Amino acid sequence: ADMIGVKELRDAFREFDTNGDGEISTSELREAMRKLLGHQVGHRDIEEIIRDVDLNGDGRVDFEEFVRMMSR
């Protein structure tokens, strides 16, 4: 059902969504992950979500993709 989590991601995007039409970079999300949720999940889990993908120069992630890395 509705588990406490997504709601935190939605607010995260609006908070990190600078002005690129609603888009964040792994860097922004990386800091967001460390800020949102926090521990209680194993610092390893967070680093994992950040390990799944890797930057290259134009690494971009939209709320959907971001939430998907989660809602996955």
Swiss-Prot record:
Residues 4-39, 41-72 form the EF-hand domain. It is found in: Cytoplasm, Cytoskeleton; Cytoplasm, Perinuclear region; Cell membrane; Golgi apparatus. Ca(2+) 3 binds at residues 54, 56, 58, 60, 65. Changing residue 25 to A: Loss of phosphorylation and loss of calcium release by InsP(3). The modification Phosphoserine is found at residue 25. Retina and brain. Somatodendritic compartment of neurons. Calbrain was found exclusively in brain where it is abundant in the hippocampus, habenular area in the epithalamus and in the cerebellum. Disulfide bonds: none annotated. Phosphorylated. The phosphorylation regulates the activity. Ca(2+) 2 binds at residues 17, 19, 21, 23, 28, 55, 59, 62. Modulates calcium-dependent activity of inositol 1,4,5-triphosphate receptors (ITPRs). Inhibits agonist-induced intracellular calcium signaling. Enhances inactivation and does not support calcium-dependent facilitation of voltage-dependent P/Q-type calcium channels. Causes calcium-dependent facilitation and inhibits inactivation of L-type calcium channels by binding to the same sites as calmodulin in the C-terminal domain of CACNA1C, but has an opposite effect on channel function. Suppresses the calcium-dependent inactivation of CACNA1D. Inhibits TRPC5 channels. Homodimer; when bound to calcium or magnesium. Interacts (via C-terminus) with ITPR1, ITPR2 and ITPR3. This binding is calcium dependent and the interaction correlates with calcium concentration. An additional calcium-independent interaction with the N-terminus of ITPR1 results in a decreased InsP(3) binding to the receptor. Interacts with CACNA1A (via C-terminal CDB motif) in the pre- and postsynaptic membranes. Interacts with CACNA1C (via C-terminal C and IQ motifs). EF-1 binds magnesium constitutively under physiological conditions, EF-3 and EF-4 bind calcium cooperatively and EF-2 binds neither calcium nor magnesium. This is Calcium-binding protein 1. It comes from Homo sapiens (Human). The lineage of its organism: Eukaryota, Metazoa, Chordata, Craniata, Vertebrata. The chain holds residues 299 to 370 of 370 of the full protein.
